């Protein structure tokens, strides 16, 4: 029920992430330009969420009659709005991919027999609204499919589970419901969740800031720990499964995700508890054969040394601040949870491209 | 070297840890009471250093002729100030043990035929001076023997090594030179240190605050990382060994240390690099046979949720904040480095009785 995106016809609202977690508050999004500025100010987080907010902000404009008149004028209007949206945060592909589809829909709904302005307007809007529902439904599917598979692996005879997660993959990283946190929501709904542990996820602290917030909001029994306590928690706090999200899963299942994920997979193996990656198919990059081919983005060292504008670390120390690490697929012992199902790493490539 | 404690006869200064790592201010100490305040104010950190700072403040006063009159009074004076010092931060026993023998030293030489006021004074002052030197030499030995063992294990053909460490075990945790950081200092002096990685060590950040400070200070080539980056560093940044300190090593070698240590050991094993625990013999507790007997401290949740007086974590979230975890001895693949040198866990009980 936590919504980072609120949408109805003619009406788009977004939860302002900058104010979290002290305050939860929405901002009305009236125009494509407003969306662009919100995305850039980091009010909207998560590539799927960024894409939807931009596309829905176009749908809000169109519903108000913006664009046109004519068809070429309207299609041109749509294309310039979409292309402008792609410039907001090009750090990820979701917006660009959604922009093509909508541009194609509007062109594939600008070149028919007896084509007309109102038809283009309504159909572009409807696809955008279909995008939203599909993404929400797929997230729920990840949650339910992943929850079932995890339960069958860890407590098939009934009996609850204690899940540990990393970074933020919830409503605050997605259109809604989430991926790995979606699995936790689904387990809670089934009444099969004993407890959820979440790590701080240094240095950007999204587990402490956002995942903690989501868990408290949903009143899911939960505990925050430091990244350094993961091993202790598995040994002493009865952790029975690990579920994380993914920034990128490559063709063999190697998973780039927020740094510390690789470490989590190692410690889970040591304690013989299954490790799951939850990722929609559109987070799976079948071009790359292995994790070797991934460039690990490194971010500025001040983002590690400083918190809230105050330097914590000693002056002059060198810093290594990779944003992500890569988990080799042989440590993904639970499986890869997609909207299409749960797959062993070696199965992923063929499964995603030959099943619906 | 970096000195948290600067002492010469009649003069004691301590590095004010509260102001680290921005500033280095040395605070002169002319009294046992002054010491007591500094220990309670947490200007002094590390059990050995706390014990030495106390005993040495007594020594500055004994050098000051504080103590009178006779001999029986001086012994009485000494016994009192040591009892006083114990009340500062009893959380660490190093002071208690220090007091009990410094008292017993003051006793035997008081019982000595023809015992005199001056002789028993100098002898007490000299004793505390000897404790300082011994502790420094023992740390140097941990570092030197540890470093040598590590080089033979990891780089027998020569070649430099990259060491990863956790929390703070250096001059800012000890009398000087340090234990795990001592090994890094020794590797560096030998020109065999490629690089040192130190973890932030959440939630008290001793790695980011203090260990990074010491490494920069001694111009040791070093990089700070978060605790969650340890695995990535091992796989991609050529870490060739781990060396950590210890709060308590028990008879079978099971080691209680700053939470995350157990995690480092697991991650080291995964990457097939040796894991060392550096521990002076007085950090070894033979009264307990295994880590199952260790009762883990949980500190308040606020000290995890908040940084710098400002809450980071989402309001209302439950918190688990154990101070320590326990590393099983069979993950101590490097060895346990005492001032006597490096032992496999199985050898430790025999070696220390």
Q: Answer yes or no: are the C-beta atoms of B51 and B59 closer than 8 Å.
A: no
Kindly tell me the sign of the dihedral angle through the C-alpha atoms of B162, B166, B170, B172: positive
8-state DSSP, B179: S
How far, in Å, CA of A144 to CA of A141, rounded? 5
Q: Answer yes or no: are the C-beta atoms of B226 and A204 closer than 8 Å.
A: no
How far, in Å, CA of B300 to CA of A265, rounded? 28
Task: Label residue A272 exposed, middle or buried (CB < 10 Å: 0-12, 13-18, 19+).
Answer: exposed
How far, in Å, CA of A98 to CA of A82, rounded? 9
Q: Answer yes or no: are the C-beta atoms of A39 and A53 closer than 8 Å.
A: yes
Which of B251, B248, B270, B258 has the alpha carbon at shortest distance from B343?
A: B251
Alpha-carbon separation of residue B103 from A235, B66, B90, B98, B110 (angstroms): 44, 16, 17, 8, 10
Pairing of strands B324-327, B255-258: antiparallel
Q: Answer yes or no: are the C-beta atoms of A5 and A39 closer than 8 Å.
A: no
Omega before B21 within 30 of 0, i.e. cis: yes
Omega before B203 within 30 of 0, i.e. cis: yes
Which of B205, B144, B64 has the alpha carbon at shortest distance from A228?
A: B205
The CATH code belonging to domain A159-356 is 3.40.50.10470
Q: Answer yes or no: are the C-beta atoms of A277 and A283 closer than 8 Å.
A: no
B199 interaction partners in chain A (CB closer than 8 Å): 228
How far, in Å, CA of B260 to CA of B327, rounded? 9
Residue B144 is a catalytic residue: no
> Quick one: tokens of B206?
């001793």
Strand extents, DSSP E, chain B: 5-8, 11-15, 26-29, 161-165, 193-199, 222-225, 241-244, 248-250, 255-258, 275-278, 284-285, 306-307, 310-311, 318-319, 324-327, 335-338, 341-343
Q: How many CB atoms lie under 10 A from the CB of residue A227?
A: 27
B317 interaction partners in chain A (CB closer than 8 Å): 208, 212-213, 215-216, 222-224
User: What distance in Å separates residue A232's CA from the closest CA in chain B?
Assistant: 6
How far, in Å, CA of B175 to CA of B187, rounded? 20
B200 interaction partners in chain A (CB closer than 8 Å): 202, 304, 313
How far, in Å, CA of A187 to CA of A180, rounded? 11
- Report the SS3 class of residue B242: strand
Q: Which of A226, A259, A308, A310 best tests the B interface by mutation, with the highest count of B CBs <10 A?
A: A226
Q: Where are the domains of chain A?
A: 1-158, 159-356
Q: Answer yes or no: are the C-beta atoms of A102 and A244 closer than 8 Å.
A: no
The resolution, in Å, is 2.3
Tell whether B204 lies on the interface with A, counting CB pairs under 8 A: no
Phi, psi torsion values for A91, nearest 5 degrees:
-60, -15
Q: Are residues B209 and A314, on separate chains, in Cβ contact within 8 Å?
A: yes
- Report the SS3 class of residue B106: helix
For every residue of A270-306, which 3-state class applies, written as one string?
A: HCCCCEEEECCHHHEECCCCCHHHCCCCECCCHHHHE
> Quick one: tokens of A258?
């927020």
Phi, psi torsion values for B312, nearest 5 degrees:
-100, -50
Instruction: Tell the CATH superfamily of the A1-158 domain.
Output: translation initiation factor eif-2b, domain 1 (1.20.120.420)
8-state DSSP, B173: T
B3-7 long-range Cβ contacts below 8 angstroms, 24+ apart: B3/B171, B3/B176, B4/B44, B4/B45, B4/B46, B4/B49, B4/B171, B4/B172, B4/B174, B4/B175, B4/B176, B5/B49, B5/B52, B5/B53, B5/B56, B5/B132, B5/B175, B5/B176, B7/B56, B7/B129, B7/B132
**For the CA atoms of B113, B119, B124, B129, what is the dihedral angle to 10 degrees?**
-130
Which of A47, A48, A43 has the alpha carbon at shortest distance from A13?
A: A43
> Quick one: tokens of A240?
């029975």
How far, in Å, CA of A288 to CA of A14, rounded? 34
The CATH code belonging to domain B159-353 is 3.40.50.10470
Omega before B69 within 30 of 0, i.e. cis: yes
Q: Which of A269, A314, A325, A326 best tests the B interface by mutation, with the highest count of B CBs <10 A?
A: A314
Q: How many CB atoms lie under 10 A from the CB of residue B309?
A: 7
Q: Are residues A226 and B260, on separate chains, in Cβ contact within 8 Å?
A: yes
Where residue B224 falls (left for φ over 0; alpha for ψ -120 to 50; beta otherwise) is beta
Q: How many CB atoms lie under 10 A from the CB of residue B116?
A: 12
Closest in B197, B312, B316 to A208, CB measured? B312
B311 interaction partners in chain A (CB closer than 8 Å): 22
Task: Label residue B70 exposed, middle or buried (CB < 10 Å: 0-12, 13-18, 19+).
Answer: exposed
**For the CA atoms of B85, B91, B92, B95, what is the dihedral angle to 10 degrees?**
10
Which residues of chain B from 263 to 322 reach within 8 Å of chain A, CB to CB?
A: 263, 266-267, 269-270, 296, 304-305, 307-308, 310-322
Sheet containing strand B324-327, edge to edge, reads: B284-285, B248-250, B255-258, B324-327
Q: How many CB atoms lie under 10 A from the CB of residue B154?
A: 17
Give the number of A-B residue pairs with CB atoms closer than 8 Å. 194
> Quick one: tokens of B86?
């114990």
8-state DSSP, B247: S
How far, in Å, CA of B67 to CA of B46, rounded? 28
For every residue of chain A, which 3-state class applies, written as one string?
A: CCCCEEEECCEEEEECHHHCCCCCCEEECCCHHHHHHHHHCCCCCCHHHHHHHHHHHHHHHHHCCCCCCCCHHHHHHHHHHHHHHHCCCCCCCHHHHHHHHHHHHHHCCCCCCCCCHHHHHHHHHHHHHHHHHHHHHHHHHHHHHHHHHHHHHHCCCCCCEEEEECCCCCCCCCCCCCCHHHHHHHHHHCCCEEEEEEECCCCCCHHHHHHHHHHHHCCCCEEEECHHHHHHHHHHCCCCEEEECCCEEECCCCEEEECCHHHHHHHHHHCCCCEEEECCHHHEECCCCCHHHCCCCECCCHHHHEECCEECCCCCCEECCECEEEECHHHCCCEEEECCEEECHHHHHHHHCCCC
How far, in Å, CA of B126 to CA of B120, rounded? 10
How far, in Å, CA of A104 to CA of A101, rounded? 5
Burial state string for A71-99 with b = 16 or more CB within 10 A and e = fewer than 16: beebbebbeebbebbbebbeebebbbebb
Q: Answer yes or no: are the C-beta atoms of A333 and A242 closer than 8 Å.
A: no
Q: Which of A181, A263, A294 best tests the B interface by mutation, with the highest count of B CBs <10 A?
A: A263
How far, in Å, CA of A312 to CA of B203, rounded? 12
């Amino acid at each position: 029920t936590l919504e980072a995106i609120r949408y109805s016809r003619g009406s788009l609202q977004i939860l302002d992430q900058l104010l979290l977690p002290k305050q939860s508050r929405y901002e009305a999004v009236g125009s494509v330009h407003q969306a662009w500025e919100a995305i850039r100010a980091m009010k909207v987080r998560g590539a799927p969420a960024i894409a939807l907010v931009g596309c829905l902000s176009l749908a809000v404009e169109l519903q108000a009659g913006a664009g046109g008149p004519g068809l070429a004028a309207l299609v041109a209007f749509v294309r310039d709005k979409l292309s402008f949206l792609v410039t907001a945060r090009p750090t990820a592909v979701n917006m660009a991919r959604a922009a093509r589809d909508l541009a194609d829909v509007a062109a594939r709904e600008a070149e028919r027999e007896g084509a007309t302005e109102e038809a283009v307007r309504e159909r572009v809007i409807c696809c955008t609204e279909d995008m939203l529902e599909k993404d929400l439904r797929d997230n729920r599917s990840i949650g339910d499919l992943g929850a079932r598979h995890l339960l069958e692996r860890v407590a098939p005879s009934g009996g609850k589970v204690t899940v540990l997660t990393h970074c933020n993959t919830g409503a605050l990283a997605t259109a809604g419901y989430g991926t790995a946190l979606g699995v936790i929501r689904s387990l809670h709904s089934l009444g099969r969740l004993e407890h959820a542990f979440c790590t701080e996820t240094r240095p950007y602290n999204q587990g402490a800031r956002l995942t903690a917030f989501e868990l408290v909001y949903e009143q899911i029994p939960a505990t925050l720990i430091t990244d350094s306590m993961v091993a202790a928690a598995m040994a002493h706090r009865g952790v029975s499964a690990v579920v994380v999200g993914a920034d990128r899963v490559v063709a063999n299942g190697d998973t780039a995700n927020k740094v510390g994920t690789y470490q989590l997979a190692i410690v889970a193996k040591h304690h013989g508890i299954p490790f799951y990656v939850a990722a929609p198919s559109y987070s799976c990059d079948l071009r790359l054969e292995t994790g070797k081919e991934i460039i690990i983005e490194e971010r500025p060292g001040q983002e590690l040394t400083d918190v809230n504008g105050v330097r914590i670390a000693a002056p002059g120390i060198g810093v290594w601040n990779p944003a992500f690490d890569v988990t080799p697929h042989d440590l993904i012992t639970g499986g890869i949870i997609t909207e299409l199902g749960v797959f062993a790493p070696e199965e992923l490539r063929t499964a995603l491209t030959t099943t619906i």
